[PDB]
Every structure is written in structure tokens, then in C-alpha cells.
Structure 1
Amino acid sequence: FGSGAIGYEFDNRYLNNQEMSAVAKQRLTSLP
């Protein structure tokens, strides 16, 4: 059948947690 309001929010939340991991590897380094 079909209804995609919980498939959407779980997929949108998995890409959020994957994006959250990617921005936690960002470093503005502090050697010369």
C-alpha cells in the first residue's frame, strides 16, 4: 500500500545524524 510520513521522518533523521557526524570531524587547526 502506501503512507510515507514515518519513512520520511526516519530517513530525514538518519541523514541528520550522518550530517551531524560529518560536522564533528571539522577542525580549524592551530599550528602555524
Structure 2
Amino acid sequence: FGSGAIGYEFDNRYLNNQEMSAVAKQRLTSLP
């Protein structure tokens, strides 16, 4: 058997969480 409802959304959530980490490391720096 198989069904990807809970599996798909947990994978999507994991990818969203590393998405947020990656963007939260982004900085428009200012020291010239």
C-alpha cells in the first residue's frame, strides 16, 4: 500500500524549514 498525503506535507515542511534558515542567513551588509 501507499499514500503520500502525510509524507508529502512533512517533506514540504522540512524543505520550508531549511528554506527559512537559508533566507534568515541573508544580509544586505553596510560597511564601506
| Class of the TM-score when normalised by the shorter of the 2 chains | over 0.9
Q: Provide TM-score, normalisation by structure 2.
A: 0.92
Instruction: Quote the Cα distance in structure 1 between the aligned partners of 2:23 and 2:3.
Output: 32
* Moved segments of 4+, more than 3 Å: none
Q: Provide TM-score, normalisation by structure 1.
A: 0.92
Gaps of 5+ in 2: none
How many residues get paired?
32
Alpha-carbon offset, residue 8 of structure 1: 0.2
The root-mean-square deviation of aligned C-alpha atoms, in Å, is: 0.4
Whose helix fraction is larger, Structure 1's or Structure 2's? 2
Instruction: Quote the Cα distance in structure 1 between the aligned partners of 2:4 and 2:17.
Output: 20
Identity within the alignment, %: 100
